[PDB]
Subunit: 175 residues, 3 copies
């Protein structure tokens, strides 16, 4: 059973679900809208071999970023052309990891599911790869897995990026 607006507000009011920072107007009929943090990481090695430690580069945007589909094949010239024309701070290609501004804690009787905003889906921008259920008892900001599938997309620091849907568990979990 999925929490409505009135349930989200109660659970947040009594500290059953923690959302920091919290904003009332981000509560929709049965979800809570989350926003795009300013930090991203880009993988730097040839393959992902999870028996090794991974190497990343980190960026911190001031306003905006251009996210390009895989195999756009960006040269320095192209990146510079995009930076000047669209006034973006960075131009990336392929998978980029980001994060919500919002920190969450879920209690033992709630699971949440992150989904990317539907207006971004309509321009083929995803902020999640998996269906994205999050365990009861989870604590943290949410990691975004950002990929553009059609053409490059500009994203803005602190925009609404997606939303959490909260669902009751049948019974409490052992967290």
């Amino acid at each position: 059973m999925i929490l409505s607006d009135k349930d989200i507000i109660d659970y947040v009011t009594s500290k059953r679900i923690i959302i920091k920072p919290f904003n009332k107007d981000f509560v929709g009929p049965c979800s809570y809208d989350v926003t795009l943090g300013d930090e991203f990481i880009i993988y730097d090695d040839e393959v992902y071999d999870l028996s090794k430690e991974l190497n990343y580069k980190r960026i911190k945007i001031k306003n905006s970023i251009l996210v390009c589909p895989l195999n756009y094949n960006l040269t320095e010239e192209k990146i510079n052309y995009f930076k000047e024309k669209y006034n973006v701070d960075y131009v990336v290609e392929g998978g980029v990891l980001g994060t919500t501004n919002e920190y969450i804690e879920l209690p033992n009787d709630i699971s949440a599911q992150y989904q990317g905003r539907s207006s971004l889906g309509r321009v083929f921008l995803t902020s999640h790869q998996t269906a994205g259920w999050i365990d009861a008892g989870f604590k943290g900001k949410i990691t975004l897995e950002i990929v553009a599938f059609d053409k490059p997309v500009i994203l803005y620091k602190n925009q609404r990026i997606g939303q959490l849907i909260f669902s009751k568990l049948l019974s409490p979990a052992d967290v």
Copy 2:
């Protein structure tokens, strides 16, 4: 809690959930199958900059369309080769937006989730990018975000494209 076949039929019978057109045989154990409309739109600008108005081209298929993965790099020659060999009306590459034939209205105590058909998923054809929850109180046809991830896929006008799963809210939402 997810509505079963018998619940979907009741909610539709009493006009709690509107599905137009409605077909009984599209009701499965715990979902409702939806069909592919004949209209698609293709984005026409270099980047998606959502502070501007977007330019699209619209197509109306009569039978079928070939959807190609991004960076198939279609020339006129290739498009013509595909049109003749597979008898398709159009050949597209990358993201294409479509719509269900079905118009839906959800009441204040139901959220629905669109998911693409699993036989299409097995050939790497998606009709949705986000997890696709739809708010209680929603009205409209459902927008499909169609992308092929392996090789080109033929789709047919009015085929089953996906399905709606309906879930009860804990409490009514203020719609």
Copy 3:
């Protein structure tokens, strides 16, 4: 309503949900972790035309596979370079279909949803394209639709690949 660890164990203990093979430690707060089978199939025709019978090639890994993003454009030389450097049995590009080791049966009052593991999502490896709800009454192993979206990813025979979330239906379905 989503089953917790204690519910998953009960349903499995009384044969309400069948999971073969079953392992207690794969039960998380509100999901059940599933593992990567050793068999994969790769589509062999130019387009997916679902009015025809499909041609596939089958592989059986002994340890590991390298999954490359679409349009990595693998030559024999590149495949050999990867096989030797990363000690993988096979190198594939684009969509590859696999399967869980686990065979499941769901009763008439449960629907399950497969989602890929979140650590794999963070390296842009998906094992499902659709949201992946599975009907009440389903019987079988789960088909994985594996695509890498950023750089090539090594997967291991029998690793945790994803997880099932089980949700109660409002009423029983006619299976």
